[PDB]
Design a protein around this ligand. Sequence first.
Ligand SMILES: NCCc1c[nH]c2ccc(O)cc12
Ligand SMILES: NCCc1c[nH]c2ccc(O)cc12
Ligand SMILES: NCCc1c[nH]c2ccc(O)cc12
Ligand SMILES: NC(=[NH2+])NCCC[C@H](N)C(=O)O
Ligand SMILES: NC(=[NH2+])NCCC[C@H](N)C(=O)O
Ligand SMILES: NC(=[NH2+])NCCC[C@H](N)C(=O)O
Ligand SMILES: [Cl-]
Ligand SMILES: [Cl-]
Ligand SMILES: [Zn+2]
Ligand SMILES: [Zn+2]
Lengths: 24, 27, 27, 24, 27, 24, 21, 13, 13, 21, 21, 13
Amino acid sequence: HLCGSHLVEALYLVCGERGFFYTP
Amino acid sequence: VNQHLCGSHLVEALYLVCGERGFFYTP
Amino acid sequence: VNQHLCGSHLVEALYLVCGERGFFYTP
Amino acid sequence: HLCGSHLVEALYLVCGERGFFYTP
Amino acid sequence: VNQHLCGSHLVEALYLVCGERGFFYTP
Amino acid sequence: HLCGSHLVEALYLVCGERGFFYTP
Amino acid sequence: GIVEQCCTSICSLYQLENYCN
Amino acid sequence: CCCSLYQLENYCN
Amino acid sequence: CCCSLYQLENYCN
Amino acid sequence: GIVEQCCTSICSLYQLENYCN
Amino acid sequence: GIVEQCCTSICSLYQLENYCN
Amino acid sequence: CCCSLYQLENYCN
Ligand SMILES: NCCc1c[nH]c2ccc(O)cc12
Ligand SMILES: NCCc1c[nH]c2ccc(O)cc12
Ligand SMILES: NCCc1c[nH]c2ccc(O)cc12
Ligand SMILES: NC(=[NH2+])NCCC[C@H](N)C(=O)O
Ligand SMILES: NC(=[NH2+])NCCC[C@H](N)C(=O)O
Ligand SMILES: NC(=[NH2+])NCCC[C@H](N)C(=O)O
Ligand SMILES: [Cl-]
Ligand SMILES: [Cl-]
Ligand SMILES: [Zn+2]
Ligand SMILES: [Zn+2]
């Protein structure tokens, strides 16, 4: 379903305002 | 806002730049 | 225009938000 | 060839001005 | 700048438009 | 690792200022 | 619709969901 | 599709 | 994930 | 080229195709 | 951080790398 | 490639 830069794109749609870590 | 659209491009850039390490984004 | 570039980001957002339902985009 | 958000990106390059439905 | 962000969208557009031929981008 | 429009996205992060050819 | 609304103010996942089928 | 750019034009408004 | 949009919300700040 | 043209006016699939090899 | 810096001036792969873990 | 970011730099102008 969500891999590589698509997972980061998915994270940014939800958290783009709150911010986040991406720690593979 | 052109900052939000911008952030979209930054996170994709960090994905590629940072690799196995990963990153923190916090606007 | 920053509206067209914007629309690019909206449709990708609707893709993910809408899922199996799908969406209509109409600028 | 064109799957997931790449298909939507493909649809937006052609129809981004005319608009469209995306009904999987 | 909204030109750089723009260029991002252009190259993705050329990818799809140009196909097997390919393209040159030069800002 | 990098295929289709992801390869072009990768090329643009490095060369987006210098410019480039994409000749598959 | 979605342009005039969501490309002036940053929309939310509620404002975006109104354009789903 | 998972077609072409020109075939995709069939889906616009 | 390679999950959902709502499950993804677990990772924000 | 493509920047100055296509990042001021919205280009078309004709204006974009001139940068193909 | 990264917004205020990197969405005013075009950043470099050095300026971007400071937000890696 | 379908390589690295640094190897990709070989293709710029
Ligand atoms: N909650 C932020 C939703 C979101 C993600 N990407 C976007 C782009 C434009 C917009 O109005 C909204 C968004
Ligand atoms: N027919 C619209 C072509 C198109 C798609 N994305 C674009 C981005 C910039 C631009 O000038 C043009 C485009
Ligand atoms: N060396 C250009 C790095 C880069 C790629 N995409 C970007 C987007 C925003 C930015 O500030 C910087 C970038
Ligand atoms: N706008 C986006 N990047 N959406 C996510 C697309 C998911 C994609 N099909 C994948 O390979 O994981
Ligand atoms: N700019 C774009 N999103 N282009 C479409 C890329 C197609 C991609 N190789 C796929 O998995 O279907
Ligand atoms: N921001 C980007 N487009 N990054 C490149 C993503 C690579 C992707 N996982 C692929 O299928 O090749
Ligand atoms: Cl943008
Ligand atoms: Cl993919
Ligand atoms: Zn953009
Ligand atoms: Zn992909």
